[PDB]
């Protein structure tokens, strides 16, 4: 199924995923597309930070859902 990952800078990233995929798997797919190291990625859905180890289905993330990406860069 397709999901979308919206960046802060305007780009929307399209991914092909399965409901059984882990958040880490999704971060690795973002790395494939954009080069961003998984350890720097913060993924957000419905105002919640998504945790590595949990699955898309765990967060009831369905087809055509939109996630948001923030880089872990502290001021």
């Amino acid at each position: 199924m397709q999901i979308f990952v919206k960046t802060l800078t305007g780009k929307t990233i399209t991914l092909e995923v399965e409901p059984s995929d882990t958040i880490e798997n999704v971060k690795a797919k973002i790395q494939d597309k954009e080069g961003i190291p998984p350890d720097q990625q913060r993924l957000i859905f419905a105002g919640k930070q998504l945790e590595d180890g949990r699955t898309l289905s765990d967060y009831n993330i369905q087809k055509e859902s939109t996630l948001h990406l923030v880089l872990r860069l502290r001021g």
Binding site: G10, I36, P37, D39, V70, L71, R72, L73, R74, G75
Partner: protein, 209 residues
């Protein structure tokens, strides 16, 4: 003259960095904030009160894009390089076009520190978030410092600073602390060098010294 030229010095630098800010509001903001110890106006585009604008991240990406040799990616890379022309411009802004390499390299470290401060929790960043284009600019200036070399700063220290700015695994990313660290380095380096102390006082805003 150092007192009278303070505002003109920072303004001249920011006119170069923000030359592609056609609307001009970020250029003005970066100049005005240097009178302040801190500000509630944050450029992270992230709601977390702070004055937030969700368009800040895209607009900053667009303003800084042309300063690089190749268009940067979303993440910060030690292979992101500022154009040699823009390096010349920012040095010319301070009358250092033909100064010694040791003075030019010190100036670039100071400008890097300045962007660490801009990106930090007291200025345009928060405890947990920080505008990536400000960090990217500081990181890429450090690549120039590393190539020119600077007495009192090792290549390992440069890479450490870059790893923190870029968010490398196992690096403490906080730019408020990184600014303090680079500031202490710049101070140690100008302790017995009046020429370097002059460059420091041209670049670092009074309120942030």
């Amino acid at each position: 003259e150092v007192l009278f030229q303070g505002p003109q010095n920072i303004s001249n630098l920011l006119d170069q960095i923000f030359q592609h800010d056609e609307q001009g509001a970020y250029r003005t903001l970066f100049k005005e904030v240097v009178r302040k110890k801190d500000t509630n106006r944050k450029l992270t585009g992230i709601k977390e009160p702070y004055s937030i604008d969700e368009t800040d991240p895209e607009k900053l990406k667009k303003i800084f894009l042309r300063l690089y040799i190749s268009p940067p990616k979303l993440y910060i890379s030690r292979n992101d390089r500022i154009s040699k022309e823009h390096i010349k411009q920012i040095l010319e802004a301070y009358g250092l076009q033909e100064a010694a390499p040791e003075e030019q390299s010190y100036a670039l470290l100071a400008i890097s520190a300045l962007f660490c401060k801009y990106s930090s929790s007291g200025i345009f960043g928060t405890e947990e978030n920080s505008p990536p284009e400000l960090r990217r600019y500081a990181c890429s200036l450090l690549s120039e410092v590393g190539d020119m070399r600077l007495e009192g700063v090792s290549q390992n220290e440069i890479v450490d600073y870059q790893n923190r700015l870029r968010g490398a695994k196992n690096a403490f990313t906080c730019t408020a602390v990184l600014f303090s660290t680079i500031q202490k380095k710049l101070q140690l380096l100008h302790k017995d060098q009046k020429n370097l102390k002059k460059i420091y006082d041209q670049i670092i805003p009074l309120v942030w010294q």
